[PDB]
Amino acid sequence: EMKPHPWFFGKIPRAKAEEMLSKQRHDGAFLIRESESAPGDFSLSVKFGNDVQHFKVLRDGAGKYFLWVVKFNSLNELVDYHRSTSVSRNQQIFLRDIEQV
Ligand SMILES: [Ca+2]
């Protein structure tokens, strides 16, 4: 179903990611943004209930992407994995695409 992935927001500020996501009405609504604070790095920003949480997408020498221990070959695979496995240590948070107008 190759369309643009409605999760990739390029370089947006952290506060803007929070403003757009806090308006979202579902838990797990999310985007990947390019970090202002760490150039060439990505952050994953997620509406969880009350609030918006940010994860840093970590990299290693082999160019893998990860949040915790499991390492992914692509951002696409990291995102999809977290559609069915909670991104959150404390809560059941599953990634779902934002809603556009
Ligand atoms: Ca909806």
Side-chain angles (χ1 to χ4, degrees), residues 6-66:
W7 48 259
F8 184 90
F9 277 64
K11 206 207 49 172
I12 49 158
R14 186 175 160 110
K16 297 299 291 208
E18 302 174 345
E19 152 181 16
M20 185 294 302
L21 279 169
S22 74
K23 293 198 204 159
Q24 291 286 309
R25 278 3 285 166
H26 310 87
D27 284 338
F30 79 98
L31 53 80
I32 295 284
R33 47 186 176 82
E34 297 199 87
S35 181
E36 322 218 279
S37 82
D41 293 332
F42 298 97
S43 304
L44 155 64
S45 293
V46 194
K47 188 202 177 86
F48 203 78
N50 192 256
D51 200 25
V52 176
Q53 304 178 193
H54 307 275
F55 294 79
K56 36 182 201 229
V57 171
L58 302 161
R59 303 300 301 277
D60 62 23
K64 301 301 182 18
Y65 301 91
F66 54 104

Side-chain angles (χ1 to χ4, degrees), residues 1 3-9 24 26-32 44-46 48 55 67-68 72 74-88 91-100:
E1 105 232 11
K3 294 199 64 263
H5 284 123
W7 48 259
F8 184 90
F9 277 64
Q24 291 286 309
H26 310 87
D27 284 338
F30 79 98
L31 53 80
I32 295 284
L44 155 64
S45 293
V46 194
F48 203 78
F55 294 79
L67 298 185
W68 299 107
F72 300 95
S74 65
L75 284 172
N76 205 157
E77 294 163 78
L78 180 159
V79 159
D80 285 352
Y81 175 85
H82 286 294
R83 290 187 192 275
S84 63
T85 293
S86 177
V87 292
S88 174
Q91 273 101 208
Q92 285 331 82
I93 313 169
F94 307 102
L95 302 187
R96 36 182 309 182
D97 306 334
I98 53 95
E99 289 177 332
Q100 324 135 116

